[model samples]
Target chain A: MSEHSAIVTWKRKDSEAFTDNQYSRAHTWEFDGGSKILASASPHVVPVPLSVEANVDPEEAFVAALSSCHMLVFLSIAAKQRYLVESYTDNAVGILGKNSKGKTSVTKVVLRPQVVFSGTSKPTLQQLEKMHHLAHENCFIANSVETEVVTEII
Target chain B: SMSEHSAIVTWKRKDSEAFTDNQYSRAHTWEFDGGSKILASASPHVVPVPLSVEANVDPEEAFVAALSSCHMLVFLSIAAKQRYLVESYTDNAVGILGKNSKGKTSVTKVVLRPQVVFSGTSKPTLQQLEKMHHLAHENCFIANSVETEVVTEII
Candidate 1:
């Protein structure tokens, strides 16, 4: 049902110091849109001096991916509901912890979404909660992972 | 067992456009931690409008990429546990979206064809390779979440 592509590339030099674990964990994620993101090991996982703290880490990417999926679906739902969302801001947090199955994984991600709506049909807390519920269930990202994704609207 | 990740996306109507305009630029940007940004939009095949413009990351592509990336990761982990040295790994994964049994439009199936080169003395048998792929699929979080079937073809 879809076609998508990304080139995740990394190159290493044999001449570089490999024993000290000082090798670059840096890589490039190139999307079809000609967008290139510099991705590297998270500073928390890798030592701060060794890891590229300024670059996007896979941990953050993983968290962002789930949040992105939810937000995308939420926006579509809002639009379809004729809610006319002016802006959407999500401060989503993904927690890396062990699951009840004793598996080491991202256990949960909380999405705190602050949305701006336009038009006369201003959604109350109840309306927003219902929409959020629909968005969460319909969101493909939420369906695809074992992680608990809860949304707290502020 | 806890970590939090957040991203930001923004879309606003262009100043010169009218509300009746059937099209607004689907070209929006995705921003993540560490100051990462990407230009994203709907696939051209899905929406043949200004959104169908070239050189942009579409949602379809993003979905495919996630599946591919997850599989690759799990495969690599499994391969390492087997004490095999992978010189290189490449996959040209393809996702086929079609009508489901319920006549609903959704991604029906995804095929991952990964080619790997090994540089080790311990080579796995054909059966072992299949087993590895099977385990990887089972372990992939993305694969586990979707209702669509994911078939792996290792070469």
Candidate 2:
């Protein structure tokens, strides 16, 4: 077994009244791999000036994570199926609203994938569908979440 | 498989001249039970580098670590119930982002390689350990919330 670690450090801004709630949402993400990132709240939720539009938000990250998971597995599966893929692109979108229980949640995500193939191997339409389905079913992230993920392969 | 897990994340604007121009820092905070709170932010992969939030846990990595942490904690709990003795656990969890099905960018997969040390008789076999991991993952609340791949490597 291997051990993974990341350190998240946040300190209260000195002199800022705790009751003000105008503290900076800006923060850092330091990973064990030595990678660091700037993060903040979504503008949609916290509003600009209060949120960071240029930075990454958890909601977008959430949708992107699922989309990325499906894409990676799809790529792996496609390669296994003898399909040579040159490029893959997706415009994944997530809806932030109420859930069936009427609670705030990211209830739906739509992944529209455009794949570029440039090899001799040709895959039937039916086979392509199977590949995506299998990829989704096997994706560890997809398997764990309750969010509805719909893939529209373009 | 059963139970609910929760986390609280907070972010506030600070020191920026204005709200727009995208100059405000994106750093934030995440609070968990037991008085555990950590600094958080956007992954450098998604935002500018040399960020002020540097040297802390970004939201992207936090997402991956959360999954990793949950899996380990649950594994420990299960091991105890099964009469197994686990001395320690460590993992270097990773989350990778790429173009998605819609050609959008985001973090997608995570591979968790955790080294576990078990002491005193009844050391777990490979099969036994793998099964434990499977159950641990199946029961992790954070693990169940995302589509990232959680691969546990047994050394």
Q: Each model's DockQ?
A: 0.31, 0.05
Candidate 2: tens digits of C-alpha lDDT, residues A1-154: 1222553333334553322445445444457646555555555555567555555555555565566556656765776666766556666776665544554555667877777665477688788888889978765456545678788878
* Residue B115 alpha-carbon offset, candidate 1, angstroms: 2.2
Q: Candidate 2 residues B1-155, lDDT tens each?
A: 11112234444444432323444454555443324455554445544654435565554555675566556655765676666666556666676765445443444567777777776576778888999998987765455555455666655
lDDT of 2: 0.58
The worst-scoring run of ten residues by lDDT in candidate 2 chain A lies at: A1-10
Which structure among the candidates has the greatest TM-score?
A: 1
lDDT of 1 by residue, B49-152 (tens): 56455576655555565566666666666776677665566666666667666565556677778777665477778888888888887776556545567788
iRMS for all predictions?
A: 4.1, 14.0
Model 1, position B121, has a per-residue lDDT of: 79
lDDT of 1 by residue, A1-154 (tens): 4565556554443564333445555555666557666666566555666567677665566565656656666666666666766667677776666545554566777878888887677778888888888877765545545567788887
- Where model 2 places Cα greater than 4 Å from the true spot, the runs are A1-4, B1-62, B65-155
Number of clashing pairs per prediction, in order: 19, 53
Candidate 1 Cα outliers beyond 4 Å, as residue runs: A7-25, A30-33, A41-59, A80-83, A119-121, B17-22, B52-54, B74-86, B98-108, B119-148
Please give the lDDT score at residue B128 for candidate 2.
Answer: 87
